[PDB]
């Protein structure tokens, strides 16, 4: 009775959400039509949260997969868990194509399949009673995912205005422009939906992904299948309080309520240390709880680009540090002692900040009983660099003349572009003003 | 005599499993002379065996070497993370919560500077 419905949308948004459902079945110990482990009731104690309980011995997703490009869902229709989702209830057989590397393609296919885009989630609710919310698993990258996802940020926030809306938004590569050229336009239209048509959001820079993907994995080649893994793992990690046992902190609307201080400061920095196969040679000094929040405050796990002086001329107010897996965490108060002396995480000087530490176990399974997981979910007011990154790549594309009339023929014939800039400077001045 | 029964008293404090001789208790002579050698084979037995117990399984040599490296700074390579980082935190007038914020910095620096067995070397507390 705290059911979240994932709205996977987009060519990259179906794919970064794919490895999120595939992560969840391997710890639930289930087969996509049967049970092959007892980890289905022993690891997973609260089994309805994104899953729906058995009716044929299998837990059926609470997922909807609508996308303009049918190529990605057909890359889900064959997989050895392609029957993990329903073959005709979670995605249509095919979808109509778009132009469709533009924001207004997907924005217009939602105003003719409008009856069905608001019904394919009402058929997913069938074991719920009271609804928790909606997660939009969409990617800003391409025109498909950015396109239907900006529409649904408004309507599910004015038909469910007390439920969570939250997208795990992930930006495309910004050091190439021919990889998606509509990138400065479709981002700032979306960034409007994140600050006054959204409750809380997760934005993750792309150059900070490929920073970990060639460091921690110790290779010299960033390919896009070492990036859909960093994403799926921190998503499945955050709902470990709404699945595995724990008292204080257990709602997903509990975590996020502590991490919003203002309706446009709510952009959360994510870090997740373990991505390495060296937690078995690091057990020779003991795996202990006396290092598992020193590695979540130290900047070497960051997934958001920001400068290296904006981390002492701005302030964290709320940082959530969830350690996972049996580790002896009754020294967790010894650990939190040693943060204040260094002042590793900055604090707000007008009052107290809060460093919330929680714990939760995980399934009796091999990467969650020898391998420890630490999720940091910060809320730092150093996020104003991302909006400056987007505004400086916005005015240069208007100096390139692109999208001053080549955007304005797929159903926009009104000027509304500076409107997204002005609301954005309202955000960027209130971020710096919020910490004193 | 007095210092044999003393040490058969300090083995009760490390538990009875190393009190009582394992073949003496067969002696009891009626000679005068020769009962002073009975004292002596008492005297070497009960004093050595309390040393065996405490060198073996309470590790007296591994504790005494460690007392040596903190109170003489023998391995000082630890102390360039210990001393440096306490001396900044005591520069203002000392309060009752100042030695607490040092011992937070000590066990902070203990595992950065990674001594042999940090769960064994955490015994230290700071008093000012």
Q: In degrees rounded to 5, what are phi and psi of residue B7?
A: -90, -15
Tokens of A293: 């929040």
What angle do helix axes A384-392 and A419-434 make, rounded to 10 degrees?
150
Tally of CB atoms within 10 A around B99: 17
**Those residues with Cβ within 8 angstroms of residue A403's Cβ, 6 or more apart along the chain or in another chain:** A182, A185, A397
Nearest residue of A to residue B118 by CA position? A285
Contact present, A26 and A37 (Cβ < 8 Å):
no
Contact present, A117 and A66 (Cβ < 8 Å):
yes
Our CA-based measurement puts residue A332 at a distance from the nearest CA of chain B, in whole angstroms, of 13
Q: In a 3-state reduction of DSSP, which class is residue B22?
A: coil
Our CA-based measurement puts residue A11 at a distance from the nearest CA of chain B, in whole angstroms, of 45
Tokens of A414: 């009104």
Give residue for tokens 């997703």. Answer: A61
Chain B residues in contact with A340 (beta carbon < 8 A): 104
**CA-based nearest residue to A320, from A287, A350, A354:** A354
Q: Which neighbouring-strand residues pair with A167?
A: A136
- End-to-end Cα spacing for chain B: 44
Distance CA A29, CA A32 (A): 10
Within 13 A of A163's CA, how many CA atoms are on the CB side? 20
- End-to-end Cα spacing for chain A: 40
Distance CA A420, CA A186 (A): 10
For residues B2-30, one letter each, b for 16 or more C-beta atoms within 10 angstroms of the residue's C-beta and e for the rest, the string is: eebeebbeebeeeeeebbeeeeeeeeeee
For residues A287-310, one letter each, b for 16 or more C-beta atoms within 10 angstroms of the residue's C-beta and e for the rest, the string is: bbbbbbbbbbbeeebbbbbbeeee
Chain A residues in contact with B91 (beta carbon < 8 A): none
Chain B residues in contact with A291 (beta carbon < 8 A): 111
Tally of CB atoms within 10 A around A112: 10
Chain B residues in contact with A286 (beta carbon < 8 A): 119
Distance CA A23, CA A3 (A): 18
Distance CA A343, CA A361 (A): 29
Q: Which neighbouring-strand residues pair with A270?
A: A377
Distance CA A380, CA A394 (A): 24
Distance CA A332, CA A249 (A): 16
Distance CA A195, CA A153 (A): 11
Contact present, A131 and A98 (Cβ < 8 Å):
no
Q: Is B114 left (phi over 0), alpha (psi -120 to 50) or beta?
A: left
Question: In residues, how long is chain A?
Answer: 436
Our CA-based measurement puts residue B6 at a distance from the nearest CA of chain A, in whole angstroms, of 40
Our CA-based measurement puts residue B118 at a distance from the nearest CA of chain A, in whole angstroms, of 8
Helices within B1-128 (DSSP H only)? 2-5, 7-10, 37-57, 60-71, 79-87, 98-110
Discontinuities after residues in chain B (C–N over 2.5 A): none
Chain B residues in contact with A342 (beta carbon < 8 A): 108
Tokens of A393: 């790549």
**CA-based nearest residue to A3, from A122, A165, A167, A131:** A131
Distance CA A124, CA A6 (A): 10
**Those residues with Cβ within 8 angstroms of residue A270's Cβ, 6 or more apart along the chain or in another chain:** A202, A204, A234, A303, A304, A375, A376, A377, A378
Contact assignment for B118 to A285 by CB distance below 8 Å: yes
Distance CA A239, CA A250 (A): 9
Distance CA A319, CA B81 (A): 28
With 0-12 / 13-18 / 19 or more C-beta atoms within 10 angstroms meaning exposed / middle / buried, residue A187 is: buried
Selected residue of B84, B108, B113 to mutate for chain A interface (largest A Cβ count, 10 A): B108
**CA-based nearest residue to A70, from A127, A24, A9:** A9
Q: In degrees rounded to 5, what are phi and psi of residue A410?
A: -120, 25
Selected residue of B107, B113, B116 to mutate for chain A interface (largest A Cβ count, 10 A): B107
Our CA-based measurement puts residue B83 at a distance from the nearest CA of chain A, in whole angstroms, of 15
Nearest residue of A to residue B115 by CA position? A285
Contact assignment for A338 to B107 by CB distance below 8 Å: yes
Nearest residue of B to residue A336 by CA position? B104
Tokens of B23: 């073949």
Distance CA A330, CA B18 (A): 35
Selected residue of A282, A283, A285 to mutate for chain B interface (largest B Cβ count, 10 A): A285
Tally of CB atoms within 10 A around A420: 17
Distance CA A390, CA A421 (A): 10
Within 13 A of A214's CA, how many CA atoms are on the CB side? 10
**Those residues with Cβ within 8 angstroms of residue A342's Cβ, 6 or more apart along the chain or in another chain:** B108
Our CA-based measurement puts residue B125 at a distance from the nearest CA of chain A, in whole angstroms, of 13
With 0-12 / 13-18 / 19 or more C-beta atoms within 10 angstroms meaning exposed / middle / buried, residue A128 is: middle
Of A290, A337, A342, the CB nearest to B111: A290
Contact assignment for A341 to B101 by CB distance below 8 Å: yes
Contact assignment for B114 to A285 by CB distance below 8 Å: yes
Going by the annotation, the residues of the binding site of A for GTP are: 141-147
- Given in angstroms, what resolution was this structure solved at? 4.6
Nearest residue of A to residue B104 by CA position? A338
SS3 of chain A: the string is CCEEEEEEECCCCCCCCHHHHHHHHHHCCECCCCECCCHHHHCCCCCCCCEECCCCCCCEECEEEECCCCCCCCCCCCCCCCCCCCCCCCCCCCCCCCCCCCHHHHHHCCCCCHHHHCCCCCCCCCCCCCEEEEEECECCCCCHHHHHHHHHHHHCCCCCCCCEEEEEEECCCCCCCCCCCCHHHHHHHHHHHCCCCCCCEEEECCCCCHHHHCCCCCCCCCCCCCCCHHHHHHHHHCCCCCCCCCCCCCCHHHHHHHCCCECCECECCEEECCCCCCCCCCCCCCCCCCCCCCCCCCCCCCCCCCCCCCCCCCCEEEEEEEEECCCCCCCHHHHCCCCCCCCCCCCCCCCCCEEEEEEECCCCCHHHCCCCEEEEEEEECCCHHHHHHHHHCCCCCCCCCCCCCCCCCCCCCCCCCCHHHHHHHHHHHHHHHHCC
Contact present, A148 and A68 (Cβ < 8 Å):
yes
């Amino acid at each position: 009775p705290r059911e979240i419905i994932t709205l996977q949308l987009g060519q990259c948004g179906n794919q970064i959400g794919f490895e999120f459902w595939k992560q969840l079945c391997a710890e639930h110990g289930i087969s996509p039509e049967g049970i092959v482990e007892e980890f289905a009731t022993e690891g997973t104690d609260r089994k309805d949260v994104f899953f729906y309980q058995a009716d044929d011995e299998h837990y059926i997703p609470r997922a909807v997969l609508l996308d303009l490009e049918p190529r990605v869902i057909h890359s889900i229709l064959n997989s050895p868990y392609a029957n993990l989702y329903n073959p005709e209830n979670i995605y249509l057989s095919e979808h109509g194509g778009g132009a469709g590397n533009n924001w207004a393609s997907g924005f217009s296919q939602g105003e003719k399949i409008h009856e069905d885009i608001f019904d394919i989630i009402d058929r997913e609710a069938d074991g719920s009673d009271s609804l928790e919310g909606f997660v939009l698993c969409h990617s800003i990258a391409g025109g498909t995912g950015s396109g239907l996802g900006s529409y649904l940020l408004e309507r599910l926030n004015d038909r469910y205005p007390k439920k969570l809306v939250q997208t795990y938004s992930v930006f495309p590569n910004q050091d190439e422009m021919s990889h998606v050229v509509v990138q400065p336009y479709n981002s700032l239209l979306t960034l409007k939906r994140l600050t006054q048509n959204a409750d809380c959001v997760v934005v993750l820079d792309n150059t900070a992904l490929n920073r970990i993907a060639t460091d921690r994995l110790h290779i010299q080649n960033p390919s896009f299948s070492q990036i859909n893994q960093l994403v799926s793992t921190i998503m499945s990690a955050s709902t470990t309080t709404l699945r595995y046992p724990g008292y204080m902190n257990n709602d997903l609307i509990g975590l996020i309520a502590s991490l919003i201080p203002t309706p446009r400061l709510h952009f959360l920095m994510t870090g997740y240390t373990p991505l390495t196969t060296d937690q078995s040679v690091a057990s020779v000094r003991k795996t202990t709880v006396l290092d598992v929040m020193r590695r979540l405050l130290q900047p070497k796990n960051v997934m958001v680009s920001t400068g290296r002086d904006r981390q002492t001329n701005h302030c964290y107010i709320a940082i959530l540090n969830i350690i996972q897996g049996e580790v002896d965490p009754t020294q967790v108060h010894k650990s939190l002692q040693r943060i204040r002396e260094r002042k590793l995480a900055n604090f707000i000087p007008w009052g107290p900040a809060s460093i919330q530490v929680a714990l939760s176990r995980k399934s009796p399974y091999l990467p969650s009983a020898h391998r420890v997981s630490g999720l940091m979910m910060a809320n730092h007011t150093n996020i104003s660099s991302l909006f400056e990154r987007t505004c400086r790549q916005y005015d240069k594309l208007r100096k390139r003349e692109a999208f001053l009339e080549q955007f304005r023929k797929e159903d926009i014939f009104k000027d509304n572009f500076d409107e997204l800039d002005n609301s954005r400077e309202i955000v960027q001045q209130l971020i710096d003003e919020y910490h004193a | 005599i007095l210092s044999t029964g003393k040490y058969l008293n300090v083995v009760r404090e490390c538990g009875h499993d190393v009190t009582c001789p394992d073949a003496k208790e067969i002696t009891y002579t009626l000679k005068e002379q020769a009962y002073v050698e009975r004292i002596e084979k008492a005297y070497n037995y009960a004093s050595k065996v309390l040393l065996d117990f405490l060198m073996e399984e309470e590790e007296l040599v591994a504790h005494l070497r460690s007392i040596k490296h903190y109170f003489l700074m023998d391995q000082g390579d630890f102390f360039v993370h210990f001393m440096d980082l306490t001396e900044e935190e005591l520069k203002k007038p000392v309060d009752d919560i100042i030695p607490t914020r040092l011992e937070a910095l000590l066990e902070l620096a203990l595992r950065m500077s990674t001594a042999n067995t940090d769960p064994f070397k955490d015994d230290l507390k700071i008093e000012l």
